[PDB]
């Protein structure tokens, strides 16, 4: 078996930078904010991402 | 295509409660939270409260927490508000709202009709009809003035006419009185003021009957 010359990545590292990016000022109050009126809805956050 | 329907308009003494209804076409409740909002005559919106079903959840603004209820009822696919406590500041004309994407967080993008709620402080009550009088003298217009509306701006004819002949829209304004008040202008070459006779209608207040005058200087 082969798996010995695949990489090592980092399987959450994604998730992890939008909770970092989540801990800025603001950003639950723009969630709170956002889900008002509606249980869904588009948001984008202070490094320009648009999150669900 | 998601639509809202409403209720019809309605008259209510002050103090006592009003619902609401609101049914929504082409959607489902719970993919569409409802946003009630309200607009005095002549003022602007007024963000009432919302329901999002799917929660199970409602809110209000705090102008209106402890007055306004809201409720849904999935079988019907339809969503009810109920504002109690009414108050002459409280006649407004009420929509139900909701929006097609995530996007518009509260960008309303489909709205209901529209529901007209009168805070009354009668009931159905007749007008009062009376004519004008030679005034001073090119052309020469003459009205015929009315008072003490209620039952909402009417409408009535018999003995009317086609199109043109001028446009009968005029205001209908309240008085201090609680009593609405419209006048009508009918405007003709000063001629015809010694030969033609001038029947002009007059709105009356339940909906189903009629005042004419005749003006004779």
């Known amino acids: 078996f082969l798996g010995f010359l695949l990489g090592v990545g980092s399987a959450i590292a994604s998730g992890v930078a939008v909770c970092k990016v989540l801990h800025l000022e603001g950003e639950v109050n723009k969630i709170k904010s956002a889900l008002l009126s509606t249980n869904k809805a588009v948001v984008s956050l202070s490094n320009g991402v648009s999150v669900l | 295509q998601v639509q809202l329907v409403e209720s019809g308009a309605e008259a209510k003494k002050p103090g006592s409660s009003v619902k609401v209804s609101c049914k929504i076409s082409?959607?489902?409740?719970?993919?569409?939270?409802i946003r009630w909002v309200r607009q005095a005559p002549g003022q602007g919106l007024e963000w009432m409260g919302g329901?999002?079903?799917?929660?199970?959840?409602?809110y209000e603004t705090q102008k209106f927490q402890g007055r306004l209820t809201l409720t849904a009822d999935e079988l019907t696919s339809t969503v009810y508000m109920e504002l109690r406590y009414l108050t002459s500041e409280d006649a407004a004309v009420y929509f139900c709202?909701?929006?097609?994407?995530?996007?518009?967080?509260?960008?309303?993008?489909?709205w209901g009709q529209g529901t007209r709620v009168t805070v009354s402080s009668a009931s159905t009550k007749g007008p009062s009809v009376f004519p004008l009088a030679p005034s001073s003298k090119g052309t020469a217009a003459l009205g015929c003035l009315v008072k003490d509306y209620f039952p909402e701006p009417v409408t009535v004819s018999w003995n009317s006419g086609a199109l043109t002949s001028g446009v009968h829209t005029f205001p209908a304004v309240l008085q201090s009185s609680g009593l609405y008040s419209l006048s009508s202008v009918v405007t003709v070459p000063s001629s015809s003021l010694g030969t033609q006779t001038y029947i002009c209608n007059v709105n009356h207040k339940p909906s189903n009957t009629k005042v004419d005058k005749r003006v004779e200087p």
């Open positions: 709202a909701t929006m097609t994407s995530p996007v518009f967080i509260d960008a309303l993008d489909v």
């Open positions: 082409g959607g489902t409740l719970n993919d569409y939270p």
């Open positions: 329901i999002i079903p799917i929660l199970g959840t409602s």
